[PDB]
Paper text:
Proton-activated chloride (PAC) channel is a ubiquitously expressed pH-sensing ion channel, encoded by PACC1 (TMEM206). PAC channel is closed at neutral pH and becomes activated when the pH drops below 5.5.
To reveal the mechanism underlying PIP2 inhibition, we solved the cryo-EM structure of PAC in nanodiscs with 0.5 mM diC8-PIP2 at pH 4.0 to an overall resolution of 2.70 Å. However, a strong branched lipid density is observed on the cryo-EM map of the PAC channel in the outer membrane leaflet, between TM1 and TM2 of adjacent subunits. When trying to fit a diC8-PIP2 molecule into this density, we found that the phosphatidyl group is reasonably well defined, with its phosphate group forming a salt bridge interaction with R93 and its two acyl tails interacting with a number of hydrophobic residues on both transmembrane helices, including W304. Nevertheless, the local biochemical environment of the site is consistent with PIP2 binding, in which the hypothetical location of Ins(4,5)P2 is surrounded by several positively charged residues, including K97, K106, and K294. Moreover, small, but notable, conformational changes are observed in the transmembrane helices (TM1 and TM2) upon adding PIP2, which supports the binding of PIP2 to PAC. When overexpressed in PAC knockout (KO) HEK293 cells, mutation of any residues R93, K97, K106, K294, and W304 to alanine significantly relieved the inhibition by PIP2 on pH 5.0-induced PAC currents, confirming that this was indeed its binding site on the channel.
Author numbering:
A (entry chain B), B (entry chain C), C (entry chain A): 62 to 339
The structure:
């Protein structure tokens, strides 16, 4: 009975120590989250399948020509500059620019590839007969998930928040750019997880054998693909790996207890020395 | 004699504690490696010299024009569109595509630069008289080491495994693309170290003064160079830095021993209290 | 009085333990910094505002046409190929190439954008009437701070050190390349903090409606912008997060003290056993 009660008391005291360490760690985290610009760590996590991203195009006057999903290969085009073979989950929304409130931007959101293991990719074609601009390009930005946008209650605000995110790029005209997008998730101290993208473009020239009559119009090609299944995650160094902080706190508490034992021994030793001397 | 025997027993017990911690850590690692998709950390390691990589080109109908090694500068071309000055360790192998078994792909593997400190780079030229394709590009993928491929027993399987790796890109025609490749090594739980590359292309237009008769043929230029000596290494967070796990385990064991001491004191205290009361 | 003296002695012994741990950690760091090629970790740190970088162009025979600061948008060009609207903090310096001492390179350093939150960007235009070269490009490299170069005592040596850094790229002619530069700081064991850049170019074709007489001259466009406020910091794994090493050292010392206590108990136990037996 004494042995089993001692084991139970061991469990109780271990639980009490765990609770104390947890409270101290929570206090440390609550104090950290108040300060701005903390040191953040990097953690990767491979995923078998990606969540479907959203590719918000900005054709403007350009007309979407063809959208199709392919796997690790692009079949030769049947006829450039001709519509058809279009089936992508495309949602059309347009809103005021958060930066310049005076201008409204038309956004074409296309569901991105999700089977990274199968090298799934999305191929888009655009056409523009007449253009008055020095540079021919279409803006596009990538956000975390297409489903979140689809079921979002405030669609306009979500797109403005995406514009605030740093994932905007361009692709040229007369070239087919292969975009290998990478996902980077950063967790803010407030709790929200901001998402930004990294890309590795591969610009490829497009050779056109079409008659000189139609050469005035310019064709835009772009391919979106996940570079690697790994997802970069950025978080506060203390919060990202709490086990290091827990180990440090346990070491500090054990050092304090050892110091208490040392003091208890030393006071007895000095009392004995004083009694022997006087 | 008592003091020296006490020191020896200190060594024995320290060794026993180290063995116990090592066994617990090995059990933790063996349990981790079973689960899929673990959290992985990032570690960089500068290298004075790089291992020679392999650049597997896919010219197809294109003919390799010139290969040469240079240091931080490209001398002006003597005559574009003309062969000669070709000396690279090139191995020609062709095999069935692992994705689409019906197609065989011709791969030209060229030994890559290895002196990153000297900014060594490899310059390649390609020519194509007649082409029937909308986009003019040559596929290329990068694997970890050329020597491994050279001495591999199953050459075909090694190339298929490289195709499975996510390091395939393209470079355009009529442009000279400077490819700054970065090495990323990820260690799987099974033990193998998968290798993938990251690139930062710099597309540069090519101006041709050649006669209009030869303008039909298109010239491909590409330059491969190591961006930085640092090599990104990705590994499981527990296994990458085992010292954190060792420290946590030592802290846990010391906390358990402190709890044992606390129980031994508390049982005596409560027994004394009970005896005094009754 | 005894209690307060015991508390004071607790403080003294805790300070002594902290000093011992600090000395051991300093010894470990001093031993580490001697060895070459250590394992380095990655830490990110968001900044509200960036320090102004330096963009050292290499126009050569090209003449700078226009420099202007913009926010997240490029207004349409008033007239391509015409100077004016030029106000950037440009410093002109030229020096001998550290790699090839025989050639002197003319560097045009332009102060880069610093308000990443406002998506500030710098737009540059270049012109070249007559050129004798196969490829039309302008070299450029990025260093950490423009102010450091401006107030540097040895300007020539600073530029040579920047050339030694791996942050050199090119942008094509007849295209507008959007450069999204990222800051990577690596701390060497000697103490200096080398700085290298990462970029994500977005090549955009430029359509010219200018008369065929002026088509001989080629126009260069480039845009520089900070991709994200996060700054990648690379440091030795032990030095980057010293708290892990401190926790491990405290755990080791506490384990040694526990082993000492175990030996003190075990010697008494075996002495008692020997006395009972004989
Ligand atoms: C208490 C035992 C030792 C814990 C130290 C373990 C805590 C720890 O690892 O902090 C490193 C961090 C460094 O700041 P950083 O710039 O890296 O973020 O410190 C702070 O600045 C705030 C600490 C929060 C305040 C801590 C309040 C206890
Ligand atoms: C035992 C003392 C405390 C050790 C905790 C130290 C172990 C530790 O750090 O695990 C974090 C990890 C979190 O999982 P994660 O998704 O990050 O991988 O846990 C597990 O999921 C498996 C643990 C393996 C199972 C652990 C079996 C003991
Ligand atoms: C002493 C208690 C345990 C400390 C271990 C904690 C020290 C520690 O974490 O080292 C890992 C590192 C691994 O080398 P690495 O290639 O990763 O750099 O070791 C060394 O090579 C030099 C150690 C410096 C020499 C250490 C001299 C004490
Ligand atoms: C492909 O297009 C057809 C209409 O042409 C549509 O019915 C079908 O659902 C589409 N499939 C996918 C996967 O988009
Ligand atoms: C989008 O733009 C159109 C005009 O092009 C106009 O109907 C309105 O601004 C927006 N309408 C839709 C479809 O949201
Ligand atoms: C632009 O309009 C928005 C609408 O909310 C407003 O918040 C912002 O201050 C305006 N900026 C101006 C006046 O330029
Ligand atoms: C562009 O030109 C084509 C030529 O057939 C025509 O069919 C189409 O209606 C025009 N409008 C756009 C911008 O697509
Ligand atoms: C360069 O080419 C010559 C043949 O033209 C060859 O003998 C020599 O080994 C080559 N050198 C290198 C380093 O490739
Ligand atoms: C490579 O392709 C050629 C035909 O171009 C043929 O000999 C066979 O498929 C392969 N031969 C070699 C050299 O491996
Ligand atoms: C393609 O051929 C390979 C040869 O191993 C086979 O494993 C795979 O199932 C085939 N796929 C088909 C039938 O499309
Ligand atoms: C291509 O054209 C050149 C012109 O001289 C000729 O020498 C060569 O044999 C042709 N074949 C290829 C594809 O190199
Ligand atoms: C802009 O240019 C004018 C001269 O044209 C100069 O006085 C002014 O300081 C410049 N402003 C900036 C911010 O460069
Ligand atoms: C820069 O080059 C010029 C010649 O173009 C010459 O004056 C000297 O080499 C350098 N001068 C300056 C302005 O530093
Ligand atoms: C180039 O000149 C520099 C000047 O310091 C010198 O250090 C270097 O050895 C020279 N290299 C040669 C001789 O090619
Ligand atoms: C280039 O041509 C223009 C045409 O007006 C002329 O004004 C200028 O002086 C020439 N020199 C350069 C290289 O700018």
């Amino acid at each position: 009975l004494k042995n089993v009660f001692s084991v139970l008391l061991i469990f109780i005291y271990l639980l009490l120590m765990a609770v104390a360490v947890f409270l101290v760690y929570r206090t440390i985290t609550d104090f950290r989250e108040k300060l701005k610009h903390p040191v953040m760590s990097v953690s990767y996590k491979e995923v078998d399948r990606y969540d479907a991203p959203g590719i918000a195009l900005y054709p403007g006057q350009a007309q979407l020509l063809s959208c199709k999903h392919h796997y690790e290969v692009i079949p030769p085009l049947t006829s450039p500059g001709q519509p058809g073979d279009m089936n992508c989950t495309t949602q059309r929304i347009n809103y005021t620019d958060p930066f310049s409130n005076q201008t409204v931007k038309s956004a074409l959101i296309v569901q991105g590839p999700r089977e990274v293991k199968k090298r799934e990719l999305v191929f888009l074609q655009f056409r523009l007969n007449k253009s008055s601009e020095d540079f021919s390009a279409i803006d596009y930005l990538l956000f975390s998930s297409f489903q979140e946008f689809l079921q979002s209650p405030n669609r306009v605000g979500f797109m403005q928040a995406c514009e605030s995110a740093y994932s905007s790029w361009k692709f040229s005209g007369g070239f087919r750019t292969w975009v290998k997008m990478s996902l980077v998730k950063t967790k803010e101290e407030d709790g929200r997880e901001a998402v930004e993208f990294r890309q590795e473009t591969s610009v490829v020239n497009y050779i056109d054998q079409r008659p000189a009559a139609k050469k005035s119009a310019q064709l835009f090609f772009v391919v979106f693909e996940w570079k690697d299944p790994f997802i970069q995650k950025v978080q506060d160094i203390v919060t990202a790996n709490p086990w290091n902080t827990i180990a440090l706190l346990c070491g500090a508490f054990l050092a304090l207890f050892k110091a208490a034992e040392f003091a208890k021994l030393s006071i007895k030793w000095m009392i004995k020395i004083r009694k022997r001397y006087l």
